[PDB]
């Protein structure tokens, strides 16, 4: 669009944090202009590429979206020295993706409904007898299929080993189908999830930690836990055939720097991906406690496996779409 670099993320508090900490200061430093857009699924970028009319330059996607998007020819190969890979978690920087943060897909519950005695595991989240009430789940499968595997009693370190079999994949879908009548909303965006929490419209929800903490900061009577949460990685990629490819490459190089990443958790509960940010910002242990990647929080989580999603995303999207139709 115009001569502006077009950058797209998923709206709300998360997009505002990226804009304030990364996009606006990096564009100012490079004397460049940018336009924001919002989207919820990388398939929208795929639609642009397949139509021959590409308007987006930079897209903010998840680490488990990257293998699928790359295989579909949706992403540009990045310039080899865009970042120093040593400054980022291993595997978080690929030839087509640069991480910007770590986050958790976790359990949050309504304190009006359950008080302090809320679901503290996926087995509890799926237990309608022990915890009666309205559930909310994402309308996309990443973090949801694995939550079902954990609810079936799979150890956190064996999630993907259990999902490697047709039997395990069908059992996780059966477990979601069993829960489906108690699911009152299949939320689509992080801001919609935060609003359900602020309004107390759901009794429990599986959503992103920063969205939950922001809703609690805004007065929501909810609590959450990192136990059984999925440790995710968000980042940037450049759309294949981007109208401002070279400018976008320079913009991505700049915004990935430690001097901008340090400001990312200022007004949104997220964890910068650039390890050098931690030395600059010197976060308080209180601030550290809110971060998905903090050692205390990591111990009770499992990391998303992009290799599982590279193999089974098509099957998972179709089987999960069928669950939500109920
Ligand atoms: O990294 C963070 O701290 C933010 C976590 C979380 N992001 C999940 C995510 O990748 C979404 O932004 C969208 O599904 C994605 O950008 C659309 O491809 C959120 O929006 O809250």
From TrEMBL:
Predominant cellular place of this UniProt entry's protein: periplasm
Q: Check the record and name the Pfam families matching this protein.
A: SBP_bac_8 (PF13416)
Q: Which CDD domains match?
A: PBP2_polyamine_RpCGA009
What GO biological process, any one, is recorded here? thiamine transport
Q: Which domain of life is it from?
A: Bacteria
Question: What Gene Ontology molecular function terms does this protein carry?
Answer: metal ion binding; thiamine binding; thiamine pyrophosphate binding
Q: Where in the cell is it found?
A: Periplasm
Would the keyword Transport be found if you checked this record's keyword annotation?
Answer: yes
Listed A to Z, the keywords are: Calcium, Metal-binding, Periplasm, Plasmid, Signal, Transport
Positions contributing to Ca(2+) 1 binding? 40, 190
Q: Which GO terms describe its cellular component?
A: outer membrane-bounded periplasmic space
Supply the InterPro entries for this chain. SBP
* Binding annotation for Ca(2+) 2: 210, 269
Q: Which family does it belong to?
A: Belongs to the bacterial solute-binding protein 1 family.
The entry's protein name is MotA
Q: What is the lineage of its organism?
A: Bacteria, Pseudomonadati, Pseudomonadota, Alphaproteobacteria, Hyphomicrobiales
This protein's encoding gene: motA
């Amino acid at each position: 669009s115009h001569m502006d670099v077009v950058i797209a993320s998923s709206g709300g508090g998360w997009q505002e944090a990226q804009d304030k900490a990364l996009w606006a200061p990096a564009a100012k430093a490079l004397n460049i202009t940018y336009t924001q857009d919002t989207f919820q699924n990388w398939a929208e970028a795929r639609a642009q590429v397949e139509s021959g009319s590409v308007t987006w330059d930079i897209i903010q996607i998840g680490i488990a979206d990257e293998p699928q998007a790359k295989a579909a020819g949706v992403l540009e190969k990045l310039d080899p020295d865009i970042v120093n890979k040593a400054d980022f978690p291993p595997g978080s920087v690929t030839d087509s993706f640069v991480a910007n943060s770590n986050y958790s897909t976790l359990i949050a519950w309504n304190k009006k409904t359950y008080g302090d005695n809320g679901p503290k595991s996926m087995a509890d989240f799926f237990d309608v007898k022990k915890f009666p009430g309205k559930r909310a789940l994402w309308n996309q499968p990443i973090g949801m299929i694995e939550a079902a595997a954990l609810a079936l009693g799979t150890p956190r370190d064996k999630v993907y080993e259990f999902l490697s079999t047709e039997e395990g994949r069908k059992a996780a879908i059966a477990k979601l189908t069993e829960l489906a009548p108690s699911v009152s909303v299949w939320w689509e965006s992080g801001a919609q999830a935060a609003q359900l929490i602020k309004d107390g419209e759901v009794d429990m929800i599986i959503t992103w930690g920063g969205r939950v903490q922001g809703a609690i900061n805004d007065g929501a009577n909810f609590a959450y836990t990192f136990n059984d949460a999925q440790l995710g990685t968000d980042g940037y990629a450049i759309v294949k055939g981007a109208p401002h490819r070279d400018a976008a490459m320079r913009f991505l190089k700049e915004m990935s720097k430690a001097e901008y990443q340090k400001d990312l958790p200022n007004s949104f509960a997220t964890a910068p991906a650039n390890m050098k940010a931690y030395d600059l910002a010197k976060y308080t242990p209180e601030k550290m406690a809110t971060m998905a990647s903090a050692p205390e929080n990591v111990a009770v989580q499992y990391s998303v496996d992009p290799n599982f999603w590279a193999k089974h995303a098509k099957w998972a999207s179709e089987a999960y779409d069928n669950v939500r139709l109920s």
